[PDB]
Design a protein around this ligand. Structure first.
Ligand code: HEM
Ligand code: HEM
Ligand SMILES: Cc1cc(N)nc(CCc2cccc([C@H](N)Cc3cc(C)cc(N)n3)c2)c1
Ligand SMILES: Cc1cc(N)nc(CCc2cccc([C@H](N)Cc3cc(C)cc(N)n3)c2)c1
Ligand SMILES: C[C@H](O)[C@H](O)[C@H]1CNc2nc(N)[nH]c(=O)c2N1
Ligand SMILES: C[C@H](O)[C@H](O)[C@H]1CNc2nc(N)[nH]c(=O)c2N1
Ligand SMILES: [Zn+2]
Lengths: 411, 407
């Protein structure tokens, strides 16, 4: 079967066949659409088909489908599963797998970049100290003094679910949040709970507005351990505005390296529960969400006060006006310090070209519109006008519950 | 089967049960989500009638009463005999209000119960349609103090005698392709404009020419009427700070009025049912003015503001956008024509959502449409999970009549 998507700005129509390869379910039914819901040990039995499907894909991609090398590899994985109940990926399969999980990530607007990903194989890691070293090298490599490079570090896969490698941090770099006795929050309100866990595990909190959190790392199912990232490895950008000289005095800064550390990478039925990956920021992630969400740094009022906007009615659009100025400031600062960043116009334009390419060469591009459309100026970006089909391909990145809810403590 | 929706800003979780009464299909499956696709007999009719009358009699706290059973009986009688049936006035009003209540793409539904319904089921000609529509326009406009209204023409019979308003909205500007290669007026209305000229309209050939109505009665060929100019309330657009803004020569109309949709009540189909409320500012300032395929004015405004248009990263587009939207709101407010900003509208809808969860067990909502086309995440709807499903009575999209009509 074929499915069509139309761009309502250009009348360009694309034909999707790739959705035929989708197996995993979406949360939607014929009677209900869950497209805006945020979250909508395997047996040998279920493992071999998953391994086979993956290796078929891998072998097709290298133009060796059906070859003796293909067949030997299938047989070899089959026997490995048969007798050890799991199997190990070759380096080449691991790289391909991690690239494809990104390629298949339907909420990611940055996917034009998917084939340039530096993959760090950390499958020989055995301890939390070992994980700390690997993550430091990843940060330094990815950061590259401002010329950011995409990378992923992949720790040992799940075995019995009792020996998981996990990075407890949600992102490798994030600022502490501290709930005050008066109910106010100092620092980032999104990280309060994790900040409390770190303190409890023994971290000495400086208690300021922009304290980089320590890493909390679990190797092989053991209790997690605390490590501080060397400050010299944490690139930060002080935020200032090209025309507004009072902007610097708000005291804002942000880190350059966006790096997700809480997701699960699935490749051929294998589960990599610690797989931190990084790219570079789109400006709106910081300037719209991190700075302006009511439940985050929430700076809109203070910014619009200083711009002396009329704040007595929402209809003066004071929030919208202050929002644009903040986002100009974030982009200006990163640019001035030579730290890679992309604006939402450029990123969405690139994504449309990427999506069109994928439709030609691949037969589709699963995309989640809710997430792809930027959180400001939606309809003056080309993605707003683009119909998209969302479905689930493997390899994939998956959400997993926070480990403090599930961890069995050794004490 | 009992589903939760969470607000990620506030942590409020609501439980939706109303979705189980959902009837029609979404386009989505367990394998593929189509949330962002714009368009995803006697035997059939009695179940639809029963379903509706059951909910009607339930709403007036008379479920299972003799009068309930008596009506079900009467409608049953009427369908078997005549192959259709007629709604009571009370049923028609209820159904109309509920079609709006069930419109999952509508941010303004806190208002749903204040809808003036004009019963035009006695209309027989296109001249009559015209009279009805002017009266609707004048009632709804109310000298700038807008009131929600719908006018409901006769229901589908055998489908060869449909009433249709050919216009997509009651009030729209003409579009003309030019020798120049460009487009004069609203590019969204070129085709319909051509049909008007084709049908006889003498186009003024200006940038903001109010289109005439093309009305079809009883499946006849459609006829042309100009809405009395004095009933079409328009607003000149000025900015409170940029004195040059008015020099762009921009105006928009005060009355948003959808005329191309099909109202379905108790299985009956009302193919001409124009309805109106009042604008949310972004519809005009973001979409009408700034869509590339619309009036597309961003460049001209940014130039007058002397912004650095050299690089996208200066956010010149975003800056000019906010300004255009400030000007729309200000102009409507200055001339006292009802308008709502996206902050106030979305705040109202969140309150409406909580009322509907508390009082009905849910509220079908389409997040892709509800979230405003600018400043998404600074409105509360951005952080609200929504379930989208189809309830009847409903408004449904229908194909442009010129594709269906045999002359
Ligand atoms: C290279 C520059 C990149 C840019 C500009 C970019 C852009 C984005 C943005 C804006 C989001 C939404 C983030 C949010 O709203 O919180 C996102 C989500 C995501 N991207 Fe990227 N991306 C990049 C690289 C990567 C890389 C390297 C990977 C992994 C290999 C990746 C996989 C994802 C995934 C899995 C999500 C969904 C995250 C979630 O559900 O929390 N992206 N991307
Ligand atoms: C009272 C003020 C009202 C406001 C502020 C309002 C708000 C809106 C907005 C902003 C949209 C999106 C339209 C677009 O993006 O093009 C919309 C869609 C819609 N509203 Fe309303 N609404 C109002 C009244 C009404 C009334 C009176 C009805 C019916 C009686 C109605 C039914 C609809 C329907 C069916 C849609 C979807 C239209 C489509 O698919 O093209 N609304 N509403
Ligand atoms: C590689 C990369 C590049 C780039 N430009 N940006 C990023 C930032 C990604 C990110 C950061 C913080 C929080 C979230 C998301 N908010 C985290 C989240 C939370 C929940 C509940 C569900 C879910 N699926 N996700 C996602 C990463
Ligand atoms: C009552 C009311 C109040 C209000 N504030 N706004 C409105 C705007 C109505 C409207 C106007 C232009 C275009 C469309 C819609 N974009 C027209 C349309 C096109 C297609 C292809 C599908 C589809 N479902 N709809 C809908 C109405
Ligand atoms: C409820 C809703 O799905 C939620 O607020 C989503 C909307 N779109 C998003 N889009 C992106 N890129 N990131 C997000 O975190 C969200 N949050
Ligand atoms: C393709 C996508 O569904 C389309 O651009 C939608 C997005 N959201 C919208 N939202 C509203 N309110 N109105 C629209 O016309 C659209 N268009
Ligand atoms: Zn869906």
């Amino acid at each position: 079967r074929f499915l069509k998507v139309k761009n309502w700005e250009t009348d360009v129509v694309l034909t999707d066949t790739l959705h035929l390869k989708s197996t995993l379910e979406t949360g939607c039914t014929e009677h209900i659409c869950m497209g805006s819901i945020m979250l909508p040990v395997r047996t040998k039995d279920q493992l071999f088909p998953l391994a086979k499907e993956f290796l078929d894909q891998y072998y097709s991609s290298i133009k060796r489908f059906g070859s003796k090398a293909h067949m030997d590899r299938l047989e070899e994985v089959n026997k490995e599963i048969e007798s050890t109940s799991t199997y190990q990926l070759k380096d080449t399969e691991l790289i391909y797998g991690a690239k494809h999980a990104w390629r298949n990530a339907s909420r990611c607007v940055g996917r034009i970049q998917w084939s340039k990903l530096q993959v760090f194989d950390a499958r020989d890691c055995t301890t939390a100290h070992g994980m700390f070293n690997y993550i430091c090298n990843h940060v330094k490599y990815a950061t590259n003094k401002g010329n950011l490079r995409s990378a992923i570090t992949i720790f040992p896969q799940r075995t019995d679910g009792k020996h998981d490698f996990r990075v407890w941090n949600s992102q490798l770099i994030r600022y502490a949040g501290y709930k005050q006795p008066d109910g106010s929050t100092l620092g980032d309100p999104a990280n309060v709970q994790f900040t409390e866990i770190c303190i409890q595990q023994g971290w000495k909190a400086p208690r300021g507005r922009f304290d980089v959190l320590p890493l909390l790392l679990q190797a092989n199912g053991n209790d997690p351990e605390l490590f501080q990232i060397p400050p010299e490895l944490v690139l930060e950008v002080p935020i200032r505005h090209p025309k507004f000289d009072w902007f610097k005095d708000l005291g804002l800064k942000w880190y350059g390296l966006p790096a997700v550390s809480n997701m699960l990478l699935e490749i051929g039925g294998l589960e990599f529960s610690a797989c931190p990956f990084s790219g570079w920021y789109m400006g709106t992630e910081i300037g719209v969400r991190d700075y302006c969400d009511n439940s985050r740094y929430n700076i809109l009022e203070e910014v619009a006060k200083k711009m002396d906007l009329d704040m007595r009615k929402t209809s003066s659009l004071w929030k919208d006006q202050a929002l644009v100025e903040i986002n100009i400031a974030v982009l200006y600062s990163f640019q001035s310090d030579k730290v890679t960043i992309v604006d939402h116009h450029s990123a969405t334009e690139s994504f449309i070209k990427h999506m069109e390419n994928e439709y030609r060469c691949r037969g589709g591009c699963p995309a989640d519109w809710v997430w792809i459309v930027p959180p400001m100026s939606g309809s003056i970006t080309p993605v707003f006008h683009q119909e998209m089909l969302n479905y689930r391909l493997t390899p994939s990145f998956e959400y997993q519950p926070d480990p403090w809810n599930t961890h069995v403590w050794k004490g």
